[PDB]
Predict the structure of Serine/threonine-protein kinase B-raf.
Amino acid sequence: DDWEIPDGQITVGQRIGSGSFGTVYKGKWHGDVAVKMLNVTAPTPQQLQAFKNEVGVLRKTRHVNILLFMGYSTKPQLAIVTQWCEGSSLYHHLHIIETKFEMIKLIDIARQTAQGMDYLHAKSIIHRDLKSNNIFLHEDLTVKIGDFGLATVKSGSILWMAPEVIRMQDKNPYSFQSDVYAFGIVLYELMTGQLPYSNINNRDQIIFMVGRGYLSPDLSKVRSNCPKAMKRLMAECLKKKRDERPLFPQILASIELLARSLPK
């Protein structure tokens, strides 16, 4: 009980990243940890909610494929301490340093990610921001899903937004199915090694057309050595029509049955 780190025990160092929901630092609390803070001297009303919420969602997670939550702090300043990922984002590997994993290390990263996402959904959580940027490859052999800022229990990163979400249909577009779509865009970059719509350089247009249904991820460019069972699954997770995407349990089983009869 109480994951409120006793006061004045955390110590932040280098500055990793940031955004609009706080800036991330690399601190130290019983070893290396990633500390997410809110420096604005006085926590505004709405912000104190971004906090209480996230922390509230994180503490419900205890799974090997979810970034381990260790504790939160308030006194010095609002902070969320999580383990320190010793590696890099699936993004960074694929699109910045262009790492070349075998088709086994890929079908695995897929398996693991879906393993954790299946977990979050059972606990009835919706991520709402799964990207190849929030998936870190810990120790270069462990998938850690992270960034639960927008997670719920029922951001110019539009490349992973299901169409029903971009089109901001009504007021509750998000759903397990929306997450299954973002999982779809990741299998995509795992299999193609590239981001979608790389040939279009206008956000408004991509956003528009993708929600309108005119534009869609080119499937004809998945590796030669990509199992047919997989390419077929990828397209199912990308279905333009929300209610036809499989849920994770199914996705998990597939990625697994298509994992045995590989071969070598």
Q: What stands out?
A: The two ends are 48 Å apart (CA to CA).
